[PDB]
Ligand binder design. Sequence first.
Ligand code: N24
Lengths: 174, 167, 341, 196, 137, 399, 281
Amino acid sequence: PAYHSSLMDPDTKLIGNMALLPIRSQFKGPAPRETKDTDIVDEAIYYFKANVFFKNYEIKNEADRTLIYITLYISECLKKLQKCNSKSQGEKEMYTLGITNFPIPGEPGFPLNAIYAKPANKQEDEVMRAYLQQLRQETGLRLCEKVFDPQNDKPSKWWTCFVKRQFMNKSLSG
Amino acid sequence: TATLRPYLSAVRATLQAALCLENFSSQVVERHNKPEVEVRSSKELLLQPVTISRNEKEKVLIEGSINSVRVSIAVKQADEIEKILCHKFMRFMMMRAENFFILRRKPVEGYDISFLITNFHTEQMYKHKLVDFVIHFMEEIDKEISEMKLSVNARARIVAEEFLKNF
Amino acid sequence: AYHSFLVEPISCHAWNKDRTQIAICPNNHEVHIYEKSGNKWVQVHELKEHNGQVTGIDWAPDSNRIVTCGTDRNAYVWTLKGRTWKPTLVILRINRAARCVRWAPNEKKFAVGSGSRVISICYFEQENDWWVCKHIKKPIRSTVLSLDWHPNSVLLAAGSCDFKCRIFSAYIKEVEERPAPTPWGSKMPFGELMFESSSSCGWVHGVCFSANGSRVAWVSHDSTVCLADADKKMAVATLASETLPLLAVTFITESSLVAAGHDCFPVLFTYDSAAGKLSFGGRLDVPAGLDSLHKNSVSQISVLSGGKAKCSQFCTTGMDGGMSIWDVRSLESALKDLKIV
Amino acid sequence: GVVVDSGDGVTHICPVYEGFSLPHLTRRLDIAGRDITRYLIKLLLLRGYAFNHSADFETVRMIKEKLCYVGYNIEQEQKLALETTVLVESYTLPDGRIIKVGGERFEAPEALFQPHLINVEGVGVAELLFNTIQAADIDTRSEFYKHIVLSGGSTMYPGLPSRLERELKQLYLERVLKGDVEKLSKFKIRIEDPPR
Amino acid sequence: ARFRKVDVGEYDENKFVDEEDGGPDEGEVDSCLRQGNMTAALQAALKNPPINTKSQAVKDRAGSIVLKVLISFKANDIEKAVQSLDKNGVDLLMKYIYKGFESPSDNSSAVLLQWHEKALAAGGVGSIVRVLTARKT
Amino acid sequence: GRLPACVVDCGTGYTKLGYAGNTEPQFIIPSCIAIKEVMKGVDDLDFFIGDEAIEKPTYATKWPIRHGIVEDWDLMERFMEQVIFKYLRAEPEDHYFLLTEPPLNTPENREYTAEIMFESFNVPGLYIAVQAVLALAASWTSRQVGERTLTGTVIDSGDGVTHVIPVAEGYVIGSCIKHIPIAGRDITYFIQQLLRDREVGIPPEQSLETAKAVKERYSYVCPDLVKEFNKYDTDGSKWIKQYTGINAISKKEFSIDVGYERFLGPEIFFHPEFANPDFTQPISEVVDEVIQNCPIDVRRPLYKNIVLSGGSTMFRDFGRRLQRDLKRTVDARLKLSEELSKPKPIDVQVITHHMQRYAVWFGGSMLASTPEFYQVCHTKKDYEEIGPSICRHNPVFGV
Amino acid sequence: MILLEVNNRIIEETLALKFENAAAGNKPEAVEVTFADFDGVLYHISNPNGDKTKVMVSISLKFYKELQAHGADELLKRVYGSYLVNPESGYNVSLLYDLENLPASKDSIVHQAGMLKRNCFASVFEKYFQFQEEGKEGENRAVIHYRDDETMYVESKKDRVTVVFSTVFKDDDDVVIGKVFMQEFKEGRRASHTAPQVLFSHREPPLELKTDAAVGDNIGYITFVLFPRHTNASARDNTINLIHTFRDYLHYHIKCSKAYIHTRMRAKTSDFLKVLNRARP
Ligand SMILES: O=C1CS[C@@H](c2cccc(Br)c2)N1c1cc(Cl)ccc1O
């Protein structure tokens, strides 16, 4: 069955009921600094091709909620990366996409509002909004070195072919 | 034929007189309910058997009782092919007696096909339509046997011609 | 006026005193009680105790007690307590299915015809607080199909598969007392055979006593209707019908009878005392593919109002699951040629 | 008096005297409810319905209780099963499938009277009942013959008290009256088989 | 396993036993027939039927006489004859007609079906019902 | 006698026919018959069956054979005419016949079959075997077995639906059968979608063609999805294959790459939700559910003898993956027990052998080759003296 | 399918497959097939001594000795030449195909191999057809017991060749149906005036054989009268192809006739049940 994260720690912090997991990134945000050689973003990208076919997903940890968000986002990236001609150009659209304000738990337009806890206050709100953006940014740029072949203008069909199945039948653009 | 209608008319009238049944609990066995014309363990519950004949070969035997009637028919069989066609057809239907619920699985000795109609049948079905059915049945098995006869002969000629024409 | 309670047979029926409720057995182990609400019929009770099909039901008017008998060899007297009917087991001491049951006019006893070739006369002993029964055996040789009490509550008419219509004395001195003489006889000891028809043909489906009880009529499977006149030395008038067998019969006046059966419609018969002759006087059902109200054999007929002396309305139930209510005056209006007496 | 008792485990014909019962003259039958359910399973298998002895035991038990009965004259019952379809009844299985059951309705219980049918030695509930009363006291034989009573689930088969009655008539006429038809008439038999 | 061979029911005192105890003028019927008086022959053949004899020989005899008359009849003269009988006669005729259906020979059933038709018109289905429930026939 | 019995196994999309004793069927033909559409003369003989019936212009194609709705007996009977006289070329009066019925087929259908066989074709003897039971007998050929047994769990997967059938002592435990809405066709469709979203130059009217071919030539079952996906994304030159077909219109060549679909197709057996929105139970779970529904006393034996039957169980490592996954579910269950409270470990074995594709026909061919087969068959003499009812029951044999 | 085919599909498809793979250069797969044909014929296709590069097709006829007395060996050799080898134990004729030495036209030999049974029968007819053409009258008639209880008699006369079949109808009612077909054969010249004349005798052999010819209620004799236009060098093969399939052609059609009657009975019974159920409220 579907692939779950093994990164939940007894000392892992939470932002809502999502796991505030560490990441290796230069982008700004409340994400802890990761020291190990792999982080939640790499994990989501590693499991994507398989996980994306699944229709059902059991939430075992608050780490899964984070894993799920990134999985859904990878789909959003592929939607944009689908129509582009160059590794350079693709990086720009990803910067833009990462900055755009996507819906968060509690808002209509965010699927899984029955599984994600909405921000309790304005601080928690802005902090979650920051983490999500930081995850989007790192996911996006990291995805580019994967989607494009050393042969420019090549949004690999091996990544493009998923542009339209929807993990758990949901969408962030929906 | 100058004697078909008169025959069926007599059979129909007798069936109307015979099909006047009612629910009857066994007088011989505690908590049993059996078709009296079949078990015949109580002579007073049995009616006089009667026969209606069209000729020396065609006839219908009707045996009534308080809760059931047994109707046996001797079908028209002019020659050998009609004899075997009738035998195969009656056997065919009797093998499916459970779906054809008013049919006996075996004919009364001396007849080609037999019906066993009980009060339970006259209760869930219009008894006048059951009478209609038996008459309809007698008329239709004759027509089907004739059609089968024509069929075999028809295919036989094409089969003989197909082989012979190829020499 | 026809009403369909179901599509399966109504095995038997019984009306309460005021004719406001009808008890019917739907080809079941149960008895359903209906009542009218406006011009609609509504089921108000479900009597479930028998472990076999109910074949007979009778309702005692004043005491308001219902008695039922079934193929399970049992008989139950039902008493209404509040909003529910409760049964009391009555042992008939028979080893075959019960076939019919009727309360006596005085409501002190009830008789049950059975396949044990006997009639069980039951009564309650307020001494031991239970129901007991005595058998009327000789000379019944077959299943008893029908029963009807004489107004004196002693004489009892019975019809059986041995082709006979008999009148017995069901005299039980411990619940009633010495009955006054009757043209049927002066000596009425328990089980005494007062009368026995002289035919050896046709099961006797139904019997009925006239309002005064000096006359008894019955219909047999040989398509005949008979009437024994106790005032003419029990002379028997017979009438052979040109149609199918009658299953039920009742007097509507001292000289008029209404019967029904396999033809599926009620017919009228009249008795000419002077000539001692029975006469057919008409189809009373004047307008699947049938021209009658009932679409299958009519198995029971009962007087609803006017009694057997001057019946004004009567009821018929049949194997079609329907129940009809007939109005005698309406019938006389629609049929200018109608007799009645 | 004798109280032929039979359950889902075993059968018993216990003779009792004024007070009480008497072990001597008390016999057990090696055939009961479960054995009949098992035989029914075998019979249905021959009809083309392969019910598993364990997985479907309760289903076949329910089929037995609803449709099974005791034949009065096996010769006549078999004719009804072979020549007509009046014995065939439809029964809906738990998974929705509807099966048709006929002759097996009276065949299964017949084991009670013909033990060999299920590979059991004995003489059958009836012959057994007869031997128990025939060997007993002479001053109670008559009384016993109309104080035989039943109890236990495996005795509510329609026609059981009747089949027993007929089987005893046959035994008494042959092993007591020598065959003197003209004296059986006055051999009183009465099977008590009450309502509760 | 013998004892079940005997049908003890045949000796059951609680059974049912019919009441039993112990024909037309042949020469008379012949007289009418030879003279062409068919209706007369019919009414004579229907006299004193052996409703009580045990032997099938005497019954089979009366049936022959009656059947002899029905066969000798002209198709168009059947209705009239049938209508000359009273209800009891019609009922008895119907019994003999069904009797005849059991011994077919050279269109014998052909004319008998004509008799059944007319007899039925006169006595109704009830006359047939009484052929069925007769214990003495 | 000197002549071998006829063995006919009728599928839903394939009838396997041949003579007993042979290892493979002499013919494997589509279970379809083409007719013209008041018959007169010899119109009834104007038909074709198998491949010869799939593409005939003036004829309408029928498949009188399915799990779903009712047997057309007229067409089944005609179908048999050519099976006997055209393909097998056997004088029916000289050969005993072994036919197969699905499990849960009714006694009535068995009498209908006998009526055709004895009264139309005059066969001397007939035996109707239940498919699942023959499949078990077929496994006796396996190196993994040492004792003959007719107790096991049969996984029959053709092109329509997959069946999980428990068998005890030669008789199917009818009340415990379970069906799965995943079979060959579903795998084909899924592979079809995968290609539609990635490859170009594929003639629409030839969409299925490519998919079925890709499945039959390149599909298999993998141990793990992510690890497999990673494999392909790294050493693509030795995992990605190419297929080339010809455009029925224009006669030119089109070449496509074959990837993920190789392992994603057969994967839907284990992860139905991938392609089926109404069914999500993994085949391993269905098998477990079935066996647990069976008598406790017969369970372990069922876990020990799980057999495969059908072309859809032919994927490389189908059995291995089933065995693994099933062992995980069952071992996990016994884990909870101990913790809560030492149940002996349950031995789970999925048997795979070389005669799987036509395990039913092979089992029938091996059994009809033995003397015992002739002992248990119902003869025409008994059919005549006793009746078609004798064909309601067919005694198991061979062990 | 009205006329039965002459070739054996199992022989042809088996060989075809082996020849295609051989020509393709693939390694040969083992083959072991045992099957039958009408008239108690038994075949066997195998690799002699396990050599997968050699495929043998063998046929077994219980009455081969009788065909041999009428030129079978000679005809077979003329047809199969070097493909014919010493017969496998248990069989009368064996063909051997070397996959490493196949002809240019592999389809042509597959066709003749499929006719093995037909070619075994051929000689007896060609022999007597020749007799007729040469005017050699008085020659003893050929007696071929093609079935355990069935015989075929061939006799040549001045202007015609007669083929008589003594067939058995195991099913009593099949005799009745068969008579219907035979009558149409007897009247066949009313549709094809040049076709062979056919005679039929039930329960009794033609007088010329009133010998140890079988007699019985289930026996039937059919006589075909072949004329020069049917027996000459130009019509010979086609005529043989037909006549040797007659017995099985007749029985095949009797059975198909019964199947058709079954469809009639399913329809009429089905309708009866509908009427019956309309009798319910
Ligand atoms: O119901 C049965 C019993 S055995 C089997 C069958 C196979 C081959 C020919 C036939 Br006559 C019947 N058969 C069957 C019938 C239909 Cl109509 C469709 C599929 C079957 O397997």
